[PDB]
């Protein structure tokens, strides 16, 4: 007709010079106020902490502030555009942290693509924050940085662009299970993705209950009795325990649903051969594994993607706010796997009467619930 | 004075859990609002900046956010207490930026002390800010830290601890030079303290137009023909040109100006031995080199300290907020001495033809009058 974008509110950046601001929540207009918030008195706040470093959580902003960190190598659906160009997205991300949950998030972009010094930069920042949210950093550097950070840090580190949608996909099935009348131990789950992402989802699924999961990569089914699969040996042991040695196509065969990661790899015809009420989660960016409508006429009962135009969008938003709010509230030295499933159930709890509506919208509770579950899911005291 | 009940009569830190918080400057609360501040509208902002980097100063908070960075190694008067314990001080310093000037500031502490590590950390995060304020990191490392950053960063890096207080004292003497009606070229200046702050004072006076400055330290007058260093630019060759080396006492002889940094000495009997109308800036604290009381008794023309307790209090809050407000409003890549001197000149002007009230307090737009002087002074 005569299209543009509309969302050309680029003037919204120009006008306010960014989208975040730092406000003191303490009195500071007078000499009396400054003798309390700074110079004289403040010396004793430092002192208490110097004797008991745990006090950092009660007397500093480490209590409620998380850092959103990126190197601008994987910003959104663009590309390695650099740290400055990434800032709009990291501070946008931080504005959500505050709006949906009560989390104070500082956006931070560093210009270094050297894995070694990135994990070393953040480790040095760790003292400052109560939580680290790695964002938009490209793979495979995005997997080693997180693991070395999770292991070496005293505060929770969460790479959102990975476990994020995973947690929402996990919640999307809990609700999918319900309207099918099946359990998670009766479901035949096929995961397309040998990468670390597909593997994580898989670990999560087994931890969530799932009895039978078959993993598939670019060369076929991961079968344990076919020592013809990469040194990533372990998933073989706990998935595909019937040992079907075939292909993706040969996997839909009576499968209750597929979780994916590769572009258009799922051709409609197959759907026909899937189980009775076939669920489908084509999470592949831009070009999904199969467009929702294009997969409904095939015979699918449920379809979800990461696209706003189709129904059932699996979006990060329903997860990162609550998880850190819950983690911060508990002063968790790290985010566990059970904590992530906890988040998935909470998210799940927000859907009363489902159908074509299995993932909750953005209501009032929706971060509180999630944070509620994350805390209490810690029902495993080492004492 | 146990009167420091504030130190306790505060613990707002516990009530508020820290003194700062992050707030959005734009709309959220509806899907449509989110549509613009985030995906997929924000994608046009990223892309635009990707094609023109000088836009980072226009469309991101970099346009107004400076980071207050320290390694918790020299936190106000407590030494090396670590990053977590330094955080309260950086939170307060950051609050001040917002309170006096418009500057948004973020406190950031670091778990390392290796110089090379620190410099490279700041280089990694600059992208994110428009200015860096080093604070409470100790010497002699802070020296290499700041100096390397100044000439290796695209955004201005400053260490408020060694220059801030220096700048205000300068502001004070520009004005005192008026009541005295003498040229900053004619005055004989003595500076007690050969440390970080000490030097920053001299270095500024010698750029502001001082011809007679002599520095004294732990052993006495620094004498160019006596001094010896472990590198050998140095203070020695730009001071004590009379080559007169002696005591810190046998040197205030008819001196018109004294700036003291961190002792508590300076005896009342010495005043009269100075020039006819001497000025005393006793900057040590809590205990000054000499209380204003005695100074005036002893026959001193003007006196100022680092005490809100007496008149002429020379305090930091007058310098850094405005020098960053302006080194940002004008988008500068460095904070130079010219800018610093300009900062002080601005400060002094906040007092229309003075008296024994050589400095300004904290009225309205103080940080602006100074920002206005620093910016437009780099425009050259
Ligand atoms: Mg992302
Ligand atoms: Mg300091």
Closest C-alpha among B115, B110, B164, B161 to residue B141: B115
Answer whether A122's CB lies under 8 Å from A69's CB: yes
B197 vs A199, A295, B322, CA distance in Å?
57, 72, 19
CA atoms within 13 A on the CB side of B363: 10
Nearest CA in chain A to B306: A39
Answer whether B109's CB lies under 8 Å from A56's CB: no
Alpha carbon distance A240, A243 (integer Å): 5
Catalytic one among A2, A19, A38, A178?
Answer: A38
CATH number, domain B1-159: 3.40.50.10380
Paired residues of B133 in beta bridges: B68, B158
Beta strand B104-109 with B65-70 is parallel
**In Å, how far from its chain's centre is CA B280?**
20
B315 carries a ligand binding annotation: yes
Ligand 1 mean position to B270 CA, how many Å?
Answer: 68
**In Å, how far from its chain's centre is CA A368?**
17
Look up residue A373 and give its two tokens. Answer: 């579950």
Q: For A317, phi and psi rounded to 5 degrees? A: -40, -45
CB pairs under 8 A between A and B: 326
Q: What is the CA radius of gyration of chain A?
A: 23
A161 carries a ligand binding annotation: yes
Please name which ligand lies nearest the alpha carbon of B46: 1
Paired residues of B109 in beta bridges: B70
Does 1.10.340.30 match the CATH number of domain A160-383? no
Nearest CA in chain A to B5: A41
B127 vs A82, B52, B65, CA distance in Å?
9, 14, 11
Answer whether A260's CB lies under 8 Å from A214's CB: no
Alpha carbon distance B179, B174 (integer Å): 10
Contacts of A310 (CB under 8 A, 6+ apart): A291, A292, A293, A303
- Check B22 against A98: CB less than 8 A apart: yes
- Check A60 against B91: CB less than 8 A apart: yes
Domain boundaries, chain B: 1-159, 160-380
First to last CA, chain A: 67
Write a three-state SS string for chain B: CCCCCCCCCCCHHHHHHCCEEEEECCCCCCHHHHHHHCCCCHHHHHHHHHHCHHHHHHHCHHHCEEEEEECCCCECCCECCCHHHHHHHHHHHHHHHHHHCCCEEEEEECCCCCHHHHHHHHHHHHHHCCEEEECCCCCCHHHHHHHHHHCCCCCCEEEHHHHHHHHHHHHHHHHHHHHHCCCCCCCCEEEECCCHHHHHHHHHHCCCCCCCEEEEECCEECCCCCCCCCCCCCHHHHCCCCCCCCCCCCCCCCCCEEEECCCCCCCCCCHHHCCCCCEEEECCCCCCCCCHHHHHHCCCCEEEECCCCCCCCCCHHHCHHHHHHHHHHCCCCCCCHHHHHHHHHHHHHCCCCCCCCCCCCCCCCHHHHHHHHHCCCCCC
Closest C-alpha among B112, B94, B124 to residue A61: B94
Answer whether B283's CB lies under 8 Å from B261's CB: yes
Contacts of A73 (CB under 8 A, 6+ apart): A79, A80, A113, A136, A137, A138, A141
Look up residue B317 and give its two tokens. Answer: 């809050």
Give the resolution to one decimal, in Å.
2.5
Ligand 1 mean position to B26 CA, how many Å?
Answer: 20
Nearest to A127 among B13, B43, B83 (CB): B83
DSSP A182-247: --TTS-EEEEE--SHHHHHHHHHHHHHT--EEEEEETTEE--TT---S----HHHHHS-TT---S-
Which residues from A are below 8 Å from B110, CB to CB? 124-125, 127-128
Alpha carbon distance B368, B339 (integer Å): 14
The b/e string for B135-149 (b: 16+ C-beta within 10 A; e otherwise) is bbbbeebbbebbebb
Q: What is the CA radius of gyration of chain B?
A: 22
Contacts of B51 (CB under 8 A, 6+ apart): none
Catalytic one among B25, B29, B38, B267?
Answer: B38
Answer whether B294's CB lies under 8 Å from B341's CB: no
Look up residue A350 and give its two tokens. Answer: 């927000």
Within 10 Å of residue B231's Cβ, how many Cβ atoms? 5
Contacts of A116 (CB under 8 A, 6+ apart): none
Paired residues of B159 in beta bridges: B134
Alpha carbon distance A99, B30 (integer Å): 11
- Check A28 against B96: CB less than 8 A apart: yes
Within 10 Å of residue B380's Cβ, how many Cβ atoms? 5
Look up residue B376 and give its two tokens. Answer: 């437009």
Helix (H, G, I), strand (E, B) or coil at A90: helix
CA atoms within 13 A on the CB side of A356: 5
Q: For A66, phi and psi rounded to 5 degrees? A: -115, 150
Contacts of A90 (CB under 8 A, 6+ apart): A68, A69, A70, A107, A108, A109, A135, A136
Closest C-alpha among A256, A302, A252, A297 to residue A276: A256
Contacts of B89 (CB under 8 A, 6+ apart): A38, A42, A43, A46, B70, B75, B76, B135, B136
- Check B127 against A84: CB less than 8 A apart: yes
Which residues from B are below 8 Å from A38, CB to CB? 89, 92-93, 95-96
Taking every pair of Cα atoms in chain A, the longest distance, rounded to a whole number of angstroms, is 77
Place of tokens 């990135």: A118
Please name which ligand lies nearest the alpha carbon of B90: 2
Task: Work out the minimum CA distance from A44 to partner chain B, whole angstroms.
Answer: 5
Look up residue A357 and give its two tokens. Answer: 């509506």
Place of tokens 């508590």: B264
Q: Which helix (H) or strand (E) holds A368?
A: helix A368-374
Q: Same fold for the domain at B1-159 and the one at B160-380? A: yes
Nearest to B78 among A43, A105, A107 (CB): A43
- Check B56 against A87: CB less than 8 A apart: yes
* Multiple choice CATH, B160-380, 3.20.20.70, 3.40.50.920, 3.40.50.720, 3.40.50.300: 3.40.50.720
Nearest CA in chain B to A9: B36
Which residues from A are below 8 Å from B42, CB to CB? 76, 88-89, 92
Task: Work out the minimum CA distance from A264 to partner chain B, whole angstroms.
Answer: 23
B239 carries a ligand binding annotation: no
Look up residue B363 and give its two tokens. Answer: 């009225």
Closest C-alpha among A3, A112, A120, A125 to residue A68: A125
- Check A82 against B41: CB less than 8 A apart: no
B309 carries a ligand binding annotation: no
The verdict on whether B212 is a catalytic residue reads no
Residue numbers followed by a gap, chain B, C–N over 2.5 Å:
232
Q: Omega of the bond prior to B140 within 30 degrees of 0, cis?
A: yes
Q: Which helix (H) or strand (E) holds A296?
A: helix A292-296
């Amino acid at each position: 007709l005569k299209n543009q974008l509309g969302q050309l509110a680029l003037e919204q950046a120009k006008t306010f010079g960014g989208k975040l601001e730092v406000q003191p929540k303490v009195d500071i207009k007078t000499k009396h106020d400054l003798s309390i918030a700074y110079t004289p008195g403040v010396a004793s706040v430092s002192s208490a902490i110097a004797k008991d470093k745990t006090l950092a959580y009660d007397l500093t902003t480490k209590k409620n502030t998380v850092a959103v960190i990126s190197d601008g190598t994987a910003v959104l659906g663009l590309g390695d555009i650099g740290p400055e160009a990434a800032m709009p997205v990291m501070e946008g991300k931080a504005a959500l942290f505050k709006a949906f949950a009560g989390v104070d998030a500082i956006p931070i972009v560093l210009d270094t693509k050297d894995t070694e010094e990135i994990i070393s930069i953040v480790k040095a920042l760790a003292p400052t924050f109560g939580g680290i949210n790695l964002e938009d950093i490209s793979a495979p550097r995005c997997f080693e940085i997180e693991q070395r950070l999770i292991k070496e840090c005293h505060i929770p580190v969460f790479h959102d662009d990975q476990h994020g949608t995973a947690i929402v996909v996990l919640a999307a099935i809990f609700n999918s299970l319900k309207l099918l009348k099946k359990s998670l131990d009766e479901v035949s789950i096929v995961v397309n993705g040998g990468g670390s992402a597909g593997l994580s989802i898989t670990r999560k699924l087994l931890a969530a209950g799932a009895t039978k999961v078959t993993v598939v990569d670019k060369f076929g089914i991961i079968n344990e009795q076919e020592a013809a699969q990469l040194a990533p040996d372990i998933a073989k042991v706990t998935n595909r325990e019937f040992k079907s040695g075939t292909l993706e196509d040969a996997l839909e065969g009576a499968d209750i649903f597929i979780g994916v990661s590769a572009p258009g790899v799922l051709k409609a015809e197959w759907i026909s051969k899937m189980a009775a009420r076939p669920v489908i989660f084509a999470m592949a960016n831009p070009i999904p594994e199969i467009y929702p409508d294009e997969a409904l006429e095939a015979g699918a009962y449920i379809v979800g993607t990461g696209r706003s135009d189709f129904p059932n969008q699996i979006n990060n938003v329903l997860a990162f706010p609550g998880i850190f709010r819950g983690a911060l509230d508990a002063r968790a030295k790290t985010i566990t796997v059970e904590m992530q499933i906890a988040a998935a159930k909470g998210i799940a709890s927000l859907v009363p009467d489902d159908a074509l509506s299995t993932t909750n919208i953005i209501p009032d509770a929706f971060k509180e619930g999630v944070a509620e579950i994350v805390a209490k899911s810690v029902r495993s005291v080492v004492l």
